[PDB]
């Protein structure tokens, strides 16, 4: 069997919400790029959809994007706006083209998400410190071999001064360290906290630090033996971040106290009136503040899933703030919060995702109109077949009637509950409603036009079904899901006693239970062949059942966390599983096999439905968006030929008018390789070597004993080797002549016997120096 | 408290320059391994020229440390001296642990000035190790004459 879908990066998805802004980038000035779950290009003074860089098809590559999901950490622009660069939630940094949406390089070397990413004033160096407790310098070539500063234990915050030298660092470790650019050494570490350096800003020569201590500590630049100028105290709660003015005559500060305040005579106090304001600061603690590039306004990165526009009270700027404007999103973040429930229609052109206070209308990716009466998140949604009306259920015990034409509610469905509506679905023509209610009863509802005395547009409640007092040990009476037989013979419904009970179209007779569940269920469904039913429960166990009991077909235990929704295909061939662990699982119904696993949801998926079209997949999640689918002695001889080969080259320097072994001199190589070989059977390596090894050998001995190097070899090693090479071969069995080696050995051994006799006399005074005090401590 | 940490930044910084205040600063603090490193680079090179008391002379003066041993107190004497007990154990390093010992008897009197803690375990402990290192260098010396003495 062939299931739909693909493993490609895009299938006409509308998964990008353009929300959750933390940072922002100033690009062309008139345009301001917004860091969100994409890169969304904004205008700085209109707030309209200029362009959105997201997943799709760039020209020249496949499975390539404009930006990714899994929220972007920092966005910034090139100093000549000629480069695009995003650090993501992974350890890899992506550089995109500014004009096109191709990619240049992928930067790896971070094992954690990037917490600091920016350019310099030169632009040729990139800098990125991450949550893996180091800061990494980068180049347009890809040069990781420049620097690696690791002296921290947490994430890192502060950086550059544009002198191309003499960097500083502020980190979230409780430390603020000082460094030199050429050869890094912690000359001084300043510590004026006990918690976390939240935000960092230098004014002109004053570096201030914000922390959990709720204080602003000021600091000097050319600093040594830390300079202190004073402490500003008690913003009210810990400050989050701040910003200097682009004209550098003020300084704006931000906190999670929802108050922004600027210093002015800037100064060590706040000395300008603030009752000129008319468009009060913010509804939610904001993350980053930027002065606008038009030099009149303000851009505020709120934690209310959007960034905004304001101003700062001053005479050059607007002395009050204006109302905040937002961009043209697709009206997916223009409406407020997370989607709990979705529903599809019969014409396959009404995609509706409800929320805390909104119900939206989509065809595939184009939005028509919103409808708002929700006093809560909607636990279930259900269209009318034909696309005329839609019935909704909120967190109140309240069902809502909406028309498709406009935002006007036709009928508020009568409040007859004491607990909220979890589930609801209708029959084939749409004239029977079965709902979820913890009033310990099952409620049928009438449905027709209102031209009579029984309202079917308000669903007058004539019939009553209640027999729920069955005794268990878990809890007696609560239902979770309800499900209608599409052939209309029976009703299936979930219960909290780990059972499902089946009763037919009319009054109670007991077809079948299912029981044996370790945990209660969330989803049960009936196919169209109508012999089997699926069940899914919070024990990470999905079971298929026919009619049996106590004979388990197969306990499909394949997840890690509890499920959300498991449903059949709308033509009885496929069934799929979405869970809390943000992964879609395709499963063939005829077998127990799996065909396709979809992991492209970095956000937790809450609800999911697939239409009767058989060509797309609709998903609800926590970013509230839809993802539509379809030798040893040779080391000695080579070493000695190298070292003598260099010494003879340096011998005829100018009175007579190889990069590496390793050192400034090769002879430091020569002794250390003697320490490289092991303490056992190196004598075999010596006795291999002929007289030429001896002639080239003794010169390094006279070299190191004129150089007075005891720092890389030792007199026990030198005597331990030379006493062997004298006993193997030889002085008057290799030559017989009164030559320079013969008188060379005389000064060599005089150096050795003197230098070793010194240590001999030092020890020989040390011991009897120690005895005589024990002679007196009687 | 915090001045201990910035004081450790002083100890990390001081190693680039002179070794005397680095020696006293790491001596009164932790850790003695870096203290072993600065004594290694100071007393490490073989040199037997003009007047010292422990051999601390170079192109830049380190005999000031000779006075800094003179200014040292008794608890630092026992704290350094137990590190001499630890460093007399293995071969090839004990020579470094010799050098300060020949110093300290030159810079304090025989009483180990008046108020003296318990170190009879120490002054008992150092004698067999140095007695053991006596004979080895004696054999290297008396065998070193044999390569000259034949021809």
PDB file of C-alpha atoms in Angstrom, chain A residues 618-724:
ATOM      1  CA  UNK A 618      -3.541  19.089   9.012  1.00  0.00           C
ATOM      2  CA  UNK A 619      -1.840  19.472  12.397  1.00  0.00           C
ATOM      3  CA  UNK A 620      -2.333  21.529  15.560  1.00  0.00           C
ATOM      4  CA  UNK A 621       0.674  22.259  17.736  1.00  0.00           C
ATOM      5  CA  UNK A 622       2.222  24.515  20.350  1.00  0.00           C
ATOM      6  CA  UNK A 623       3.452  27.093  17.866  1.00  0.00           C
ATOM      7  CA  UNK A 624      -0.246  26.858  16.731  1.00  0.00           C
ATOM      8  CA  UNK A 625       0.394  26.163  13.052  1.00  0.00           C
ATOM      9  CA  UNK A 626      -0.327  23.556  10.386  1.00  0.00           C
ATOM     10  CA  UNK A 627       2.246  21.438   8.553  1.00  0.00           C
ATOM     11  CA  UNK A 628       0.556  20.326   5.328  1.00  0.00           C
ATOM     12  CA  UNK A 629       1.925  17.079   3.871  1.00  0.00           C
ATOM     13  CA  UNK A 630       1.245  15.182   0.651  1.00  0.00           C
ATOM     14  CA  UNK A 631      62.537   1.992  13.024  1.00  0.00           C
ATOM     15  CA  UNK A 632      63.624   3.056  16.516  1.00  0.00           C
ATOM     16  CA  UNK A 633      67.289   3.136  15.567  1.00  0.00           C
ATOM     17  CA  UNK A 634      66.114   4.664  12.309  1.00  0.00           C
ATOM     18  CA  UNK A 635      64.444   7.368  14.386  1.00  0.00           C
ATOM     19  CA  UNK A 636      67.827   7.806  16.037  1.00  0.00           C
ATOM     20  CA  UNK A 637      69.818   7.893  12.771  1.00  0.00           C
ATOM     21  CA  UNK A 638      67.319  10.126  10.973  1.00  0.00           C
ATOM     22  CA  UNK A 639      67.233  12.301  14.098  1.00  0.00           C
ATOM     23  CA  UNK A 640      71.024  12.587  14.282  1.00  0.00           C
ATOM     24  CA  UNK A 641      71.414  13.174  10.543  1.00  0.00           C
ATOM     25  CA  UNK A 642      68.852  15.954  10.940  1.00  0.00           C
ATOM     26  CA  UNK A 643      70.468  17.580  13.978  1.00  0.00           C
ATOM     27  CA  UNK A 644      74.039  17.344  12.731  1.00  0.00           C
ATOM     28  CA  UNK A 645      72.682  18.398   9.316  1.00  0.00           C
ATOM     29  CA  UNK A 646      71.510  21.631  10.937  1.00  0.00           C
ATOM     30  CA  UNK A 647      74.521  22.167  13.228  1.00  0.00           C
ATOM     31  CA  UNK A 648      76.969  21.975  10.321  1.00  0.00           C
ATOM     32  CA  UNK A 649      74.740  24.423   8.449  1.00  0.00           C
ATOM     33  CA  UNK A 650      74.887  26.888  11.328  1.00  0.00           C
ATOM     34  CA  UNK A 651      78.610  26.304  11.882  1.00  0.00           C
ATOM     35  CA  UNK A 652      79.891  28.195   8.839  1.00  0.00           C
ATOM     36  CA  UNK A 653      77.596  31.162   9.613  1.00  0.00           C
ATOM     37  CA  UNK A 654      79.473  34.259   8.343  1.00  0.00           C
ATOM     38  CA  UNK A 655      83.086  33.958   9.514  1.00  0.00           C
ATOM     39  CA  UNK A 656      83.273  31.727   6.456  1.00  0.00           C
ATOM     40  CA  UNK A 657      82.002  34.656   4.418  1.00  0.00           C
ATOM     41  CA  UNK A 658      64.058  22.157   7.611  1.00  0.00           C
ATOM     42  CA  UNK A 659      61.196  23.765   9.500  1.00  0.00           C
ATOM     43  CA  UNK A 660      60.693  21.161  12.219  1.00  0.00           C
ATOM     44  CA  UNK A 661      62.142  18.480  14.322  1.00  0.00           C
ATOM     45  CA  UNK A 662      60.685  20.381  17.077  1.00  0.00           C
ATOM     46  CA  UNK A 663      62.180  23.366  18.881  1.00  0.00           C
ATOM     47  CA  UNK A 664      64.181  26.526  18.425  1.00  0.00           C
ATOM     48  CA  UNK A 665      67.075  24.050  18.449  1.00  0.00           C
ATOM     49  CA  UNK A 666      66.993  20.473  17.105  1.00  0.00           C
ATOM     50  CA  UNK A 667      69.007  19.145  20.074  1.00  0.00           C
ATOM     51  CA  UNK A 668      66.033  19.653  22.415  1.00  0.00           C
ATOM     52  CA  UNK A 669      64.373  17.262  19.998  1.00  0.00           C
ATOM     53  CA  UNK A 670      67.252  14.802  20.282  1.00  0.00           C
ATOM     54  CA  UNK A 671      67.268  14.244  24.037  1.00  0.00           C
ATOM     55  CA  UNK A 672      63.481  14.237  24.334  1.00  0.00           C
ATOM     56  CA  UNK A 673      63.120  11.407  21.841  1.00  0.00           C
ATOM     57  CA  UNK A 674      65.512   9.561  24.135  1.00  0.00           C
ATOM     58  CA  UNK A 675      62.876  10.078  26.820  1.00  0.00           C
ATOM     59  CA  UNK A 676      60.194   9.056  24.307  1.00  0.00           C
ATOM     60  CA  UNK A 677      61.473   5.474  24.038  1.00  0.00           C
ATOM     61  CA  UNK A 678      60.726   3.148  26.946  1.00  0.00           C
ATOM     62  CA  UNK A 679      62.824   2.144  29.966  1.00  0.00           C
ATOM     63  CA  UNK A 680      63.091  -1.498  28.863  1.00  0.00           C
ATOM     64  CA  UNK A 681      65.194  -2.939  25.999  1.00  0.00           C
ATOM     65  CA  UNK A 682      66.265   0.384  24.483  1.00  0.00           C
ATOM     66  CA  UNK A 683      69.774  -1.091  24.708  1.00  0.00           C
ATOM     67  CA  UNK A 684      68.801  -3.131  21.658  1.00  0.00           C
ATOM     68  CA  UNK A 685      68.188   0.165  19.867  1.00  0.00           C
ATOM     69  CA  UNK A 686      71.628   1.386  20.940  1.00  0.00           C
ATOM     70  CA  UNK A 687      73.636  -1.707  19.996  1.00  0.00           C
ATOM     71  CA  UNK A 688      72.182  -1.568  16.480  1.00  0.00           C
ATOM     72  CA  UNK A 689      73.819   1.690  15.789  1.00  0.00           C
ATOM     73  CA  UNK A 690      77.339   1.888  14.298  1.00  0.00           C
ATOM     74  CA  UNK A 691      80.294   4.218  14.866  1.00  0.00           C
ATOM     75  CA  UNK A 692      78.728   6.921  12.660  1.00  0.00           C
ATOM     76  CA  UNK A 693      75.980   7.140  15.245  1.00  0.00           C
ATOM     77  CA  UNK A 694      78.738   7.623  17.829  1.00  0.00           C
ATOM     78  CA  UNK A 695      80.472  10.424  15.921  1.00  0.00           C
ATOM     79  CA  UNK A 696      77.191  12.201  15.281  1.00  0.00           C
ATOM     80  CA  UNK A 697      76.131  11.255  18.815  1.00  0.00           C
ATOM     81  CA  UNK A 698      78.715  12.833  21.139  1.00  0.00           C
ATOM     82  CA  UNK A 699      78.295  16.304  19.599  1.00  0.00           C
ATOM     83  CA  UNK A 700      74.783  16.584  21.053  1.00  0.00           C
ATOM     84  CA  UNK A 701      76.210  15.645  24.451  1.00  0.00           C
ATOM     85  CA  UNK A 702      78.764  18.452  24.320  1.00  0.00           C
ATOM     86  CA  UNK A 703      76.000  20.712  22.984  1.00  0.00           C
ATOM     87  CA  UNK A 704      73.638  20.084  25.906  1.00  0.00           C
ATOM     88  CA  UNK A 705      76.433  20.170  28.466  1.00  0.00           C
ATOM     89  CA  UNK A 706      77.577  23.534  27.187  1.00  0.00           C
ATOM     90  CA  UNK A 707      73.937  24.637  26.998  1.00  0.00           C
ATOM     91  CA  UNK A 708      73.316  23.653  30.683  1.00  0.00           C
ATOM     92  CA  UNK A 709      69.965  22.096  29.843  1.00  0.00           C
ATOM     93  CA  UNK A 710      68.767  19.957  32.734  1.00  0.00           C
ATOM     94  CA  UNK A 711      65.223  21.075  31.889  1.00  0.00           C
ATOM     95  CA  UNK A 712      64.667  18.465  29.157  1.00  0.00           C
ATOM     96  CA  UNK A 713      66.963  15.570  30.069  1.00  0.00           C
ATOM     97  CA  UNK A 714      68.841  14.506  33.166  1.00  0.00           C
ATOM     98  CA  UNK A 715      72.304  13.354  34.168  1.00  0.00           C
ATOM     99  CA  UNK A 716      71.079   9.815  35.104  1.00  0.00           C
ATOM    100  CA  UNK A 717      69.816   9.442  31.517  1.00  0.00           C
ATOM    101  CA  UNK A 718      73.024  10.800  30.018  1.00  0.00           C
ATOM    102  CA  UNK A 719      75.256   8.587  32.143  1.00  0.00           C
ATOM    103  CA  UNK A 720      72.856   5.666  31.704  1.00  0.00           C
ATOM    104  CA  UNK A 721      73.188   5.894  27.923  1.00  0.00           C
ATOM    105  CA  UNK A 722      76.825   6.958  27.567  1.00  0.00           C
ATOM    106  CA  UNK A 723      78.001   4.201  29.881  1.00  0.00           C
ATOM    107  CA  UNK A 724      76.360   1.713  27.535  1.00  0.00           C
TER     108      UNK A 724
END
